[PDB]
Amino acid sequence: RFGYSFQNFDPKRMARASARDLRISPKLAVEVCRELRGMMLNDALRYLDDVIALKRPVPLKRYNDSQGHKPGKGFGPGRYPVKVAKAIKKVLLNVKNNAVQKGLDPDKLKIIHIAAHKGPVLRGWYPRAFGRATPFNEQTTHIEVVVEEIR
Amino acid sequence: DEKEFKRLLRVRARLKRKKPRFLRQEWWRYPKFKNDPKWRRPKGIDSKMRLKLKGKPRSPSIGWSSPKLVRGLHPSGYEEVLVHNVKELEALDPKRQAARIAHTVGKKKRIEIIKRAEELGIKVLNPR
Amino acid sequence: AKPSYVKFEVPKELAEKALQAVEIARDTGKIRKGTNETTKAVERGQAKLVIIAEDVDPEEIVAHLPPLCEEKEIPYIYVPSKKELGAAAGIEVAAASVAIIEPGKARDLVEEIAMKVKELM
Amino acid sequence: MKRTGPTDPNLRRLIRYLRKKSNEYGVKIWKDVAWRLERPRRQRAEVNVSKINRYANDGEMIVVPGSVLGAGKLEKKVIVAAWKFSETARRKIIEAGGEAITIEELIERNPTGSGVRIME
Amino acid sequence: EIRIKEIKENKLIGRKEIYFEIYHPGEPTPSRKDVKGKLVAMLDLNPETTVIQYIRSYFGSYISKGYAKAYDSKERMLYIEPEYILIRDGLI
Amino acid sequence: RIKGVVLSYRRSKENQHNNVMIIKPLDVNSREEASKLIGRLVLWKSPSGKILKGKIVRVHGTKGAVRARFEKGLPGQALGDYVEIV
Amino acid sequence: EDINKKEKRLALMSAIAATANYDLVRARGHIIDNVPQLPLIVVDDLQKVQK
RNA sequence: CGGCCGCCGAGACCCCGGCGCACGGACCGAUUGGUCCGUGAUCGGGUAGGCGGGCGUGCCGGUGGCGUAGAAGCCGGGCC
RNA sequence: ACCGAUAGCGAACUAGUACCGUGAGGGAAAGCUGAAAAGCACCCCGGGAGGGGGGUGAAAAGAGCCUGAAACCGGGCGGCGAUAGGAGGGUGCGGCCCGAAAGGAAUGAGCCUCCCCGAAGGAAACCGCGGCGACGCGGGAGUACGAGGGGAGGGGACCGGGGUUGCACCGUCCGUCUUGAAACACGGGGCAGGGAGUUCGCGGCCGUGGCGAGGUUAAGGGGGUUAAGCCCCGUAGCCGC
């Protein structure tokens, strides 16, 4: 895809980036983006690094079936989507570079919009018992982010 | 008589303000009915709407019709006439008819129609 | 021009200046739109400049205005269309007459219009 | 099914004219002929010169709300008005010395329709 | 209430064609004699040399449409107008 | 200006009339006393300040209640609420 | 569809009769302002023109 | 239990305005009809089924038109 | 007067092609950039895929290419939101929110005041009397009021309508067999598209039109025509007398 769901983007105070056709879990991508929204860019990068290092659980509020709780307050279902965090860190660095080349200050960027969408489905089949072949599909994800320099 | 005209216009206004939107049964339940809202007579053997029970939507009846003298008239009280060019614009009655420019008329012809209607003193419902 | 209340020819540029003057008056100061409201404004003397549309029909509702205003000695100007007059006044529907009671940000403009209309008649 | 009535504009106009004429002159013969003409096409009146000769007197005026046909023989001198005439019927009437006219001419000649006899 | 929507003159055939509309809310279709009288009275036409070609009513609308002709002289009518129309008018 | 309490709608066991309400004025406890208020207006004030108006048309029962007809029926949150007569 | 020969002949007769009328020809849509008269009969000379 | 007195309570009964229907009438349409008028306490629920009118889609013979100053199509609103 | 890519031949295309069965044999899906590739030169980030600038084009229509509906999913916006019960809706209104156009409206909106007439209906204060009593009778009075129909005065921008939600009352889904359906009877995850009184022969009727003691052609022939349209003939035959 090419478009963005953001409405009032302008090329003076905002910078945007995207990723298309990511072989990651859209559900966990949505759950991670929920917490990433409304945070400073550097703080979000540190949060993703912690999640990758397995030091900070990501809470689950929508898709949390058969998920055990975690130590500390607010847990509740949580897990560590390392693959999704690694995929989204690249998008965050890309938007940081976009802002820097545009002339914004990286230390004052705040993530004002970030979203994840389900993309095309890649199809395959798995053999089962009694002669049944059953779907076996990869769900790709689109990620969009736009940040604004606070002043 | 303008007095009866106004009285019946008010009567129709009240009646059509109280009139409900006639929609088929279970229009809300399924999207296939929401995107295409219509009314269809309930014909089932156990249909509650067909049985006309209280607490269920109503159905159209001949009694709901508006008074004859003002049926089909604009809320302003005039009479609509669809117009596609100046020739049929000129054939209206300014004291009793109004012109509605067809949606498919371009601006080039629409400006001409509007200026001609202004010259002839004929009301236009969509002057643009 | 229908002769019931039209007294003099108001040039197009003067009408445009009157329109923008009433626009700025509505934006900044206070105005009083409508025929009855304008009539009361001039009768009480709170108005400073009055604007009349040139497309009023029937004429018995706005004809009396200049006869009743020449008594109070208040400047009156004409504009082409009541539709545009009302649009400037800020109401979607037409405005036959308008009265400015304080020409905020428009003192000099109203003075110029008054001088020109006085010279004309 | 529904009775549409005659498709002939001339026949519809004649029916309406007959009703108006009956109203104007205060007589019922024209209304009677009107509804008799209105009856369904498959039942429209059919008359023959034989029957006209049988029942009509010399110099009498005859109105047939339908068609007149030339089956038989005719001696009487009769003024017959009918919606349609077969060529044989018209020729026989002319030879016998009568007149083959329409209900319009009949109305013009005898607006009150006094002495006119209806044959079906 | 008769309002004339068109008047046309044709001296080549020698007549005047009149297209008009009668606005009669709450009233039946006016009689042909009444319409002819009103039209002749308004247009100063000669009552003896004018015909009402047709009066038509369309559905619930109280605006009926009328077409009429007015000839200069009886010669043109006897030459053009058909016998059935002349009889219907009753002017012959 | 008198005070009154909105008791309920005009109702049968299972039927409700939305445009009529039963009102109990503060200091009337008889049909005779209540009948003197026939024709007077009744005002109900919305929480946002909007005012709804009705008029007293008849006396209800024998204990002093009255019937008030409202062009715009009360929302129903007015039940047990206060209204002003005149 | 089939139509009787006599009925077809009568219909043709009626059409030819209507072709010379004034009200119907004008009402159809044709513009007859400049026509000398109805029916418009022309001399035999019209049959020899091939340009 | 033998009675009684008030008050509530239906789309029922009465009234005001409106619609249609059946029947009759006047006037008026160039294909089944249209406008209005008079009576309806003795017209207005409805399954099977019978009958009349109307709304919508593709194409053809006519007639009158719109469109790159923006047609069809598609999303959300106003009016009838 | 055939269909217009789930239609029309199975195949509008590398279609009896790919694929299934040992075999005889069975047999799909799949059309569209733009006027011209002018099909994105260069810069930053990235392992790459690709992302952000910047260019081309009237319009990205960006090749995953005419339009881009619904189902479904993610974000923002407006409403409700952790003491509350009913097939998810109906009647009435109240909060919050939207409200340029098409609806009314400054030639006056909601609104406030006053005046007149008012159908059916219809009180009370007070006075006298009857009843053990609840209460009733006569006057007040057919009065105040009354659906609605009109008029005048003040103010000067809303009303109608729409989204969500709250309160009162009511309401046990849709189709179907059945005497009987909410049914612990059957068919009912959602959306889009397709989908079921057709043609001929004979016969009985009705609506209309032509001719009429007659009616009507069939096969076929000639003229004319770009043409199978159009004109005339054709009495064998069939029905009736």
Q: Is F27 exposed, middle or buried (0-12, 13-18, 19+ CB in 10 A)?
A: exposed
Distance, in angstroms, between D13 CA and closest chain E CA?
Answer: 10
Which residues are CB-neighbours of A134 under 8 A, at least 6 positions away? A125, A126, A127, A128
- How many Cα neighbours within 13 Å face the side chain of F73? 13
Q: Can you tell me the distance from the alpha carbon of E51 to that of E44, in angstroms, rounded to the nearest whole number?
A: 14
Beta bridge partners of E55: E66
- Helix axis angle, A26-36 to A41-53, nearest 10°: 130
Order of strands across the sheet that contains C76-79? C30-33, C97-102, C49-53, C76-79
Buried/exposed code over A25-51 (b: 16+ C-beta within 10 A; e: otherwise): bbbbbbbbbbbbeebbbeebbebbeeb
Contacts E–G by Cβ distance under 8 A: 6
Instruction: Round and report the angstrom distance from CA (A9) to C1' (I53).
Output: 15
Output DSSP code: residue D111. T
Contacts of B4 in chain E (CB under 8 A): 26
Which residues are CB-neighbours of E40 under 8 A, at least 6 positions away? E46, E47, E50
Distance, in angstroms, between E62 CA and closest chain B CA?
Answer: 9
Which of E4, E22, E63, E65 should we substitute to test contact with B (largest number of B Cβ atoms within 10 Å)?
Answer: E63
8 Å CB contact of D108 and E87: yes
Q: Resolution in A, one decimal?
A: 2.7
Asked if residue C86 keeps its beta carbon closer than 7 A to nucleic acid strand I, the reply is yes
- Segment (H or E) for C13: helix C12-28
Cβ atoms B103, B83 nearer than 8 A: no
Q: Which chain B residue lies closest to E60 (C-alpha atoms)? A: B68
Beta bridge partners of A68: none
Which of B95, B96, B120, B122 should we substitute to test contact with E (largest number of E Cβ atoms within 10 Å)?
Answer: B96
Cβ atoms C69, C52 nearer than 8 A: no
Contacts of D9 in chain E (CB under 8 A): none
8 Å CB contact of E80 and G23: no
Contacts of E21 in chain B (CB under 8 A): 93
Contacts of E84 in chain D (CB under 8 A): 10, 13, 104
Cβ atoms D43, D21 nearer than 8 A: no
Cβ atoms E81, E91 nearer than 8 A: no
Q: The tokens of D71 are what?
A: 């089956």
Asked if residue F19 keeps its beta carbon closer than 7 A to nucleic acid strand I, the reply is yes
**Among chain B residues 77 through 96, which have CB within 7 angstroms of nucleic chain I?**
none
Q: Can you tell me the distance from the alpha carbon of C109 to that of C105, in angstroms, rounded to the nearest whole number?
A: 8
Q: Can you tell me the distance from the alpha carbon of F74 to that of F70, in angstroms, rounded to the nearest whole number?
A: 7
Q: Which residue is nearest to nucleotide H17 (CA to C1')?
A: B11
Experimental method: cryo-EM
Instruction: Round and report the angstrom distance from CA (B106) to C1' (I192).
Output: 34
Cβ atoms A108, A149 nearer than 8 A: yes
Q: The tokens of A68 are what?
A: 């055990």
| Nucleotide lying nearest to F34, CA to C1' measure | I124
8 Å CB contact of E13 and G22: yes
Instruction: Round and report the angstrom distance from CA (F39) to C1' (I136).
Output: 27
Q: Can you tell me the distance from the alpha carbon of C15 to that of F75, in angstroms, rounded to the nearest whole number?
A: 52
Question: What structural domains does chain C harbor?
Answer: 2-121 (3.30.1330.30)
Q: Can you tell me the distance from the alpha carbon of A3 to that of D93, in angstroms, rounded to the nearest whole number?
A: 95
Q: Can you tell me the distance from the alpha carbon of A107 to that of A89, in angstroms, rounded to the nearest whole number?
A: 17
Covered bases, chain I (protein CB within 7 Å): 44-46, 48-54, 62, 64, 69-76, 88-96, 100-108, 112, 123-126, 135, 144-147, 149-150, 155-157, 160-162, 166-171, 173-178, 181-183, 190-192, 206-218, 231-234
Considering just the CA atoms, what is the radius of gyration of chain G in Å? Answer: 15
Helices (H) and strands (E) in chain B, counts: 5, 2
Alpha helix (H) residue ranges in B25-106: 31-34, 48-51, 86-89
Q: Which residue is nearest to nucleotide H7 (CA to C1')?
A: F61
Contacts of D13 in chain E (CB under 8 A): 84, 88
SS (H, E, C) chain F: CEEEEEEEEEECCCCEEEEEEEEEECCCCCHHHHHHHCCCEEEEECCCCCEEEEEEEEEECCCCEEEEEECCCCCCCCCCCEEEEC
Per DSSP, the three-state class of E72 is coil
